[PDB]
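Reopening: structure tokens for the zinc ion complex, inputs below.
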Amino acid sequence: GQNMRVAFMPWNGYNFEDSILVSERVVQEDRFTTIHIQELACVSRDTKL
Amino acid sequence: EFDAIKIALASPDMIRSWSFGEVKKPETINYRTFKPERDGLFCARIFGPVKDYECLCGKYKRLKHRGVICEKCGVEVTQTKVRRERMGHIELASPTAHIWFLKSLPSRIGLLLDMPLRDIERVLYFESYVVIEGGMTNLERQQILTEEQYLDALEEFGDEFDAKMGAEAIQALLKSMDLEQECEQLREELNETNSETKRKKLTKRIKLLEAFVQSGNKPEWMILTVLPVLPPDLRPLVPLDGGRFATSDLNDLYRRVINRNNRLKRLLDLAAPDIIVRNEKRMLQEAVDALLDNGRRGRAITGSNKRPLKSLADMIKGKQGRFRQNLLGKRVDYSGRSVITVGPYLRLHQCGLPKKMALELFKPFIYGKLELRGLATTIKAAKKMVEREEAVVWDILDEVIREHPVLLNRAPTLHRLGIQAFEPVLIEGKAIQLHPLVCAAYNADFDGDQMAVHVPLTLEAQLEARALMMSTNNILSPANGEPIIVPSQDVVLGLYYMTRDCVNAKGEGMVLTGPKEAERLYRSGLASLHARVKVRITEYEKDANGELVAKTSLKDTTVGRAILWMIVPKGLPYSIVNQALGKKAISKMLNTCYRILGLKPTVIFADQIMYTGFAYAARSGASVGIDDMVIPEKKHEIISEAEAEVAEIQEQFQSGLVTAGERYNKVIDIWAAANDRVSKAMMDNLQTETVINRDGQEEKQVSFNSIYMMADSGARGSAAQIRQLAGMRGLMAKPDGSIIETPITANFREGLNVLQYFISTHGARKGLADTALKTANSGYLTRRLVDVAQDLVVTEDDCGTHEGIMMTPVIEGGDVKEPLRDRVLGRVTAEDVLKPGTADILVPRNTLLHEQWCDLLEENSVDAVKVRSVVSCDTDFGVCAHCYGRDLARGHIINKGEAIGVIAAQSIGEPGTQLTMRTFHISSIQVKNKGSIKLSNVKSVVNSSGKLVITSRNTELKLIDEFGRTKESYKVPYGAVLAKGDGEQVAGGETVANWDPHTMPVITEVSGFVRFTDMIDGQTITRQTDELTGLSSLVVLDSAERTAGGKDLRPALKIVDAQGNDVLIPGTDMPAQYFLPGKAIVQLEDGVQISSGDTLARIPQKDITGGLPRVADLFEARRPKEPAILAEISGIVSFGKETKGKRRLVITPVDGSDPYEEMIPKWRQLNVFEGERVERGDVISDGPEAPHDILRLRGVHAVTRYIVNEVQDVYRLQGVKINDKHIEVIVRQMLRKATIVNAGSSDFLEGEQVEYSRVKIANRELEANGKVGATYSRDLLGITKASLATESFISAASFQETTRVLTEAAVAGKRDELRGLKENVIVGRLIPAGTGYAYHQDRMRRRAA
Amino acid sequence: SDEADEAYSVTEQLTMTGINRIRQKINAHGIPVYLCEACGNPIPEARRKIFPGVTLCVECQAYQERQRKHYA
Amino acid sequence: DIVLNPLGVPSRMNIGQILETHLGMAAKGIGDKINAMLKQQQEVAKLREFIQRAYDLGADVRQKVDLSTFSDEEVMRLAENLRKGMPIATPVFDGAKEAEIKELLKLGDLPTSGQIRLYDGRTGEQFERPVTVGYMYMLKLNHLVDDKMHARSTGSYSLVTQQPLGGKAQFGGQRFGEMEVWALEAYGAAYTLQEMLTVKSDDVNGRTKMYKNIVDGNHQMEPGMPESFNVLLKEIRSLGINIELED
Amino acid sequence: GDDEDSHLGDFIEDTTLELPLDSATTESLRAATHDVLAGLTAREAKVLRMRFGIDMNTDYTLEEVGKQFDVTRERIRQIEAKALRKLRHPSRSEVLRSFLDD
Amino acid sequence: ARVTVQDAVEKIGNRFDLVLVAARRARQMQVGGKDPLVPEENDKTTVIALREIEEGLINNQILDVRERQEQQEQE
Ligand SMILES: [Mg+2]
Ligand SMILES: [Zn+2]
Ligand SMILES: [Zn+2]
Ligand SMILES: [Zn+2]
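Re-run output (same inputs, fresh job):
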């Protein structure tokens, strides 16, 4: 993970049941960006036509 | 379009008329050019073309040749959809019995001919022969012979006798048989003969014959002479990736039938050796049965990949079949799915819908609106624009979205509030923002849960999301009127922090001129949210006729309550906000806002409450720290005392003073007491510990501990969980209930060492695994109750009856548990209810008792009110609008077309999710308050002693004060020594009666000498020696050890005068003697006195289940194992032959069938005397009551009251609340069956179980006539058998054994008039329940014009 | 709520009913017998003082405890 | 950086999370001091002194570390890697006791109560009742919303049972199961149910006919009969059971 | 190997069905061509509906069109070429052409 | 928009009669030709027909007699 500076407090309902109210410096500083490597594939089979 | 679904057998001519051509070869396709081979299992000549409007060769491809049958390959040029409806037929060269009609158990073939099953299957496989009208020589019609028997028959009986073999013989047998002739013979055997069970089975066969005649079926159609093959596009053979095809197993099964059929044709035209021909016929029969229902005669074949090939029967039946998994619930377009987040800014009717998730759901509407506004020339330009997300598409989308609701639905939709309609709000993101207040409805939090979105497309479907399924119309739970818009956890804590007070805060004690000034003081920073203060508030009251009379005054409130008062709507009082506002109080405030101001003010109050709660919770900064779990410093000395007592017990165990189990129990008791002590210490340290100064020294108030605030406000917590954080964790438990004696004396604030943690993991994993099932088998009770109680619909505004239930408070034990206002609120009365002095005509008959009439009822302290119930409603095929009362949620009165059955099942099953998945178990009256005595079964005598004694059996005594209301109820035994007797109004601190379980008296009527008549010791009495008092006792016993000479004889105690005459029992001329059964010690002598009910014979010496199984069993209506036998008839009782397990209990009525008698299990403690007049509908031995017993004895209201009270016991045990309308509906479906006692002028069988509604209507229309109706007797079934009997075979095949249902329908030739909720859904029509109920009424009016 | 949040109520009911039945097994009232109801011997002052309202001597209690241990 | 609900601690009895908030605040407070010392350059002596204080700091522990066996530039690599906060070990049932946490807080210049006063970002005012603020280690599970979110209006359909199939993982619509049918029978929503099981799912003509009506500005359907029921009729009739539809 | 006890027969898609965007992209084309043909004399309109299969049964050859018009095939070819020329220009081509995403 | 249909319920009684009567009127306006009896606030046909039902000037008897009048004048 990442060690984030969390404050335990309500703040206007934006963490109501178990939501998390994350600041915009956390997505600015890119400390939860992840890299995801999909693989697509194109097979050229031999149809009757 | 189409009326009912007709069903029957299939004539071979009808099966040849279905088909579009025979199937002669087992060829699917060619292996190089994958065109259908023939004249095979995939054929273009039979099953239409394999490409649209295209012949097979290619000679005809244009549309102009539409319909042509091509000259070359005879392939009719038409659509390829045609390949999905045309059927073929295989022509079985030999007959072949339908396995459905040979293993249906009873075998329809078998029970039609009256030939037992093994004989049929022995003639079937050529094991034997069966004669078929074997001439006028020797034999019976269905006389089966062995092989050599037939061989010798052909010698001595050459011709004029014909016995066949195999399915050909069964075909000839069914064919030659004439149904009316045999039916006559059955008439003669049924009415000229009396052998009860033989005639039961006889009449069953008779009914089957009459059904086979009523229908158009012919018995010889149960033998498949012609076999139809499914259309190819239902059993397709599809090209996969790599050229390896994919086929449904039906192609394998059709191929195996076709090869064997062709080989049988071959062998037949070779004159082959007839044993080989027998084998071919047998194999073909087995193949046809694997094709029709595999694994129904032998072992499933096979399959090719070692798994049982599925056949057509498997295609219908099974949980993974066709009636269930794509017929009732299917996949759906115009729907999405996303992670839900919260978004507290939404209004209660709207939800955030991602732009990306909305541009895909409304693409049709967006294309239409683009092409309409001219922004795009055509649908293709529109599609391109949306595909590149032009700038204008977001305006077009905001216009499509505006009034268009969408259905939001969570996964386990337990109750109907799980599919709610919202208006969308195009939000940026990829997560649905769901309004906080709804999450209690959905039972949904934001730990990653997801929801599905659907678009109600059509006009009539998108006014139902607006008028029925919308989020704002649904604020009340249908299981109980309480609003489910309860603010849950941040809101109740914001409101708790707001509306509270501190002993001395900034700006305490300053007069304010209104809520506005309080808010301006708080925002300015000059006065705290809880500072005691006086504010002039003006509250309104609409007890006037709609008018709100105002009133202003200087309330002594705080700044928090002041600021909160601005939010409250007009007509509410100020006491609603002038307490500390927990969670319970917070939802009571909403309930009062509803019950005063209707729906719209409450809907606005909800989100106002929510916004202001979140705002002030955030203002409060209420965090939680590790110092907020203040452990009490008295915990160590309490634990030292506990360890000391435990060491004391260990020493007393090593000393030889207690067993091992006793030391275990004493240790657990010590540790439990110590845990309660430490928790009380930590709570006393937590709750009040805040100590402050007001003008001087000091003062304590309710603590501001953050964790205590969460525990007390009701947001989150209890005493148990805070105790585990602060006190001790107490004793863990192993999974099987085995409580560990080593208690975790630590909390989570301080550490937990390794051993305590490992101990706790036991119960932890048991709880986890248990909720891993209770989630998996989530809604099985709602499913079982939507099966039995589905097709009820409120279909009439009034049936106009006068029958109901005498609803009263459940005043059990002490004070009531459920008052009258809970249980009579919302139901229409059955009869005009007057005051106790009657004073007026208080409440009319058909007035819906809303809140005002309940006010009226508990001003006058009305105790019993008759209120109409749904189990007594006289409607036909439904329930009147008034015999259901007020409907929750919507809260006015149920309008005809409510599907009250589905709602009743869902309301009994969503609450049941909150119950335990396991079934778990659990001198002088301390009478409580002042009041008067109340007698039921008043037969008491005042002894010479002066106190009272119940000379009756079941005298029930109640303490009833000057209120008119009953305040205490009690069951009094047979003649306890009552300190207080009859009608004696007394107060608290005065016991109503003393008794003793070692003392059950046999008190008499009069005073006098107790002579001993009919008493000779050695045969009925026992020699109990008075080593305790210094006398002799002859105690009454039965024939258990005394010989049989005088064993049945009872020891009679003759209560007579001083002269010797038999003093009668006052009331009956039988004198005052008593015949005594055992268990009552006699301390008298012969020729001895007793006072007015002196001690003649003295008899010496609460667990409740609560699991959801205790509701599935309460509804399933089974029989307990200690079944309290009741009093079947009134009159007197006699005891007869004993020592058998059934001692004769004769009941001689007053004027009825006097020799009536029953059996008694003499292992039981029989608790009634033989001289007392038995009352019908009364208990004899004491134990759990049986439902069927009550239903036969006391009436339908008796069984309904019992079932309702038991289910309400198990529901109130866990605090879970559910109304009783729903259980009354489940019962009304439960006792749906009548039974014919007397045939009468009616036209049902003698002892036939018929639908009670049927007998009701028939005998009612006869009562209108001059003929005597049928005297019915109401049955009582379990839900899984009250659902088994359903009129429409579609629904029955849906939720039952499908093969049994379709076989019964096929033979009977039933016609399914689609008039049930579960049938119409299957056939795609409107359910005749809600919005489509008017449509179905118009359909019923069109039919029979 | 989460699967760990109703599992708590399950475990809570479980330990609660367990402790309840066990501390109901104990006897707190007083009906001084002074003699066992199985072997007739006087229940001594010590044992009858630990458990008020004890109804059986030590060894009869052990016997019945074992017998019920087999569930017979 | 992150704001978490306080109410999830009492109900869900995991005091570990607030204890770790406190200890992380301590561990970042011992890193802030090192960072300040490293930017207003003092010298390796005083920096070494403070790190040696922070490294002993407890009861009898087996973490005997002494910064005298460290080359002066071996203390600046360490002093750089402790700039963003010092790590802290805490074996499972052998952890740091609360007194150790308070002492490590006091060694930094944080409040011993583990709690700070905080001001609203918007109104600039001060929250009453100081709040827990600390550095907590937060993981990002791969229940990413970029995979959970999907939607469909009209896509592919299965070949045998002509229902929405999809296959874009997953362009198939949502499964309107049985409990949802009961939920819509509970309301009187007959039209919603009907379109939800014939026009949006099964009926092959009604759906292509309604996609035209939606585009034509006409919101109204002709439902017809589901191909599930047509298939069921064909299969029952493909037994010996003649099942027909009485007009 | 799925959660719903799914089978291989549930994922076999359908390659013959025409998507309802591709039926509403054919009815739109029928309406567009009926419009653009209405902007024309009965000569061109009738001869084009007859030469092609537009709103009619089997498209006839040139000789059948001529027998319906009592004129020889080359006149029919000239007429249809005239009409297609007239339709090729914008004001008669903009609406049809948008049906061509090529 | 329209948050509650509580007022429209009292004008028609049944909550299903209301839906079937309002869908009828809103389809009259949608397809088509007929006009709203109330100043449309940039609403859709559904909420327009609901709001007209709120004001008592739309219901089953009124809509049916409006049917009869045009059936007459269609001749
Ligand atoms: Mg969850
Ligand atoms: Zn051909
Ligand atoms: Zn009724
Ligand atoms: Zn003993």
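DSSP finds nine helices and six strands in chain D. Residues 16-39 of chain D form the longest helix (24 residues). Marking as resolved unless the reporter disagrees.
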